[PDB]
């Protein structure tokens, strides 16, 4: 009975079995729903800060496009920035995409731009930002190797770069490429496997606790509780979102030269329901109380010769 009581007291684990919690690798922090991660007691000041942040975003966007002697215009796509306002310091951060060992000996335009953000001793952009906020700023770029890992980048890139593929109408090859980004992953299978792994982990911890046990609720030493639990085994299995299960991309507006009317054109793949939440302890959560956590929706509206158009993107991520 004492042993049972002790177990009950200590019974905690990663959520997702059928005494458990959603770990920081199993769900998003609701702070990562907003883009200006701040609280100030004077609300005027907070408003001023969020205005500043918004203005900086525009500036960053402007910077992101470079030129090379009027020969090549490499348009680096960037995500919407997320500004982390700690008491000590601001930290701006964004995800970005850029399209033999010969380039160890010259600085690329993108590289130069990235260096400008933090490395130029006095001259750097972070230093200049610090005057607007009255605290040390740190811009961290994060490179994405694919166009479709971030939703904003995906939508933005299509808006800016791939004009010719959809201006008259969506070219067949381009559409095919869009369709067959991902390899049609059995999302049901993956979620189920993840759940099984979580169950196994829980059993392992429970087994360890039992072994230790053979009015105070202290078990044995840490090494014996977490016997088989390590950095190599657990973290990557527990990591929640990893697999772009399903995605929808919508082109809309005057994307037809002959026609005067508009054209809604939608590409759909995979699925947008998540089966990890359907049969387990882990529950779905809503970002800004209206977007299922796993979803991420975005649009970007470039102007054409004919007029305005936009490109919705929506990915699922198991």
């Amino acid at each position: 009975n004492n042993m049972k009581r002790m177990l009950n007291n200590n019974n905690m684990n990663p959520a997702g079995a059928n005494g458990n919690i959603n770990n920081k690798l199993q769900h998003l922090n609701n702070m990562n729903n907003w883009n200006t991660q701040i609280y100030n007691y004077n609300k005027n000041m907070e408003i001023m800060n969020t205005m500043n942040d918004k203005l900086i975003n525009k500036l960053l966007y402007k910077m992101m496009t470079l030129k090379l002697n009027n020969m090549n215009i490499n348009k680096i796509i960037m995500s919407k920035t997320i500004n982390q306002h700690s008491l000590n310091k601001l930290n701006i951060k964004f995800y970005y995409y850029n399209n033999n060992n010969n380039n160890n000996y010259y600085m690329n335009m993108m590289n130069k731009l990235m260096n400008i953000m933090n490395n130029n001793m006095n001259n750097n952009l972070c230093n200049i930002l610090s005057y607007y906020y009255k605290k040390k700023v740190t811009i961290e770029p994060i490179k994405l190797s694919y166009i479709y890992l971030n939703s904003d980048i995906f939508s933005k890139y299509i808006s800016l770069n791939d004009m010719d593929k959809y201006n008259n109408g969506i070219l067949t090859n381009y559409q095919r490429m869009l369709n067959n980004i991902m390899p049609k992953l059995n999302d049901h299978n993956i979620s189920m496997n993840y759940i099984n792994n979580i169950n196994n982990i829980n059993n392992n911890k429970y087994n360890n606790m039992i072994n230790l046990l053979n009015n105070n609720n202290y078990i044995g030493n840490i090494n014996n509780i977490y016997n088989n639990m390590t950095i190599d085994n657990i973290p990557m299995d527990i990591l929640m979102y990893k697999y772009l299960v399903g995605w929808s991309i919508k082109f809309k507006g005057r994307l037809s030269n002959n026609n005067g009317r508009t054209s809604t054109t939608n590409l759909l793949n995979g699925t947008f329901n998540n089966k990890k939440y359907l049969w387990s302890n882990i529950n779905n959560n809503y970002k800004l109380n209206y977007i299922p956590s796993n979803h991420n929706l975005y649009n970007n509206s470039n102007i054409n010769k004919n007029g305005k158009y936009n490109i919705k993107v929506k990915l699922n991520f198991i």
């Binding site: 000590n88 130029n120 001793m121 006095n122 001259n123 750097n124 230093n127 200049i128 610090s130 005057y131 607007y132 906020y133 009255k134 605290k135 040390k136």
Partner: protein, 165 residues
Amino acid sequence: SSEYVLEEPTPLSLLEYTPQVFPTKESRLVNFTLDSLKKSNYPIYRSPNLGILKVHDFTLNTPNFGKYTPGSSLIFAKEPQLQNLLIEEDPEDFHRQVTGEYQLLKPYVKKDFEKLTKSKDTVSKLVQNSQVVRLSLQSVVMGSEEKKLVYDVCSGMKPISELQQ
């Protein structure tokens, strides 16, 4: 895959991060010093200017930075180096912050009022008015000289014209 280089925490590293308002006398002096450094435009919150970059040594802290009424655009004035940098460190500011010295204005005496106006009751009324003004102006925050000027204007010792300048 490398060893964690443990840099030991120290009071010196936690200096700057000390609360701006803390009861202690020692802390107050430190806070004042920090404020003076900030006023001087010392590299706090930012990387310093040394003798490496020559052309691009720019700053934004000019006499009227985040302000509209002075007609200009963003002025990129050159910063000094860490050498050849002065600190303002004014006495009045020190008196305000470190000690708790305050001016309180001066109450206008009846004799001064008699110098201008003749009748006694009128003088007494003027004195009363000046007294009323004084406490209100103490309560309000404006500026040492400007506030005094306002107080004088309200009293009638100075005319209205001295405000509009």
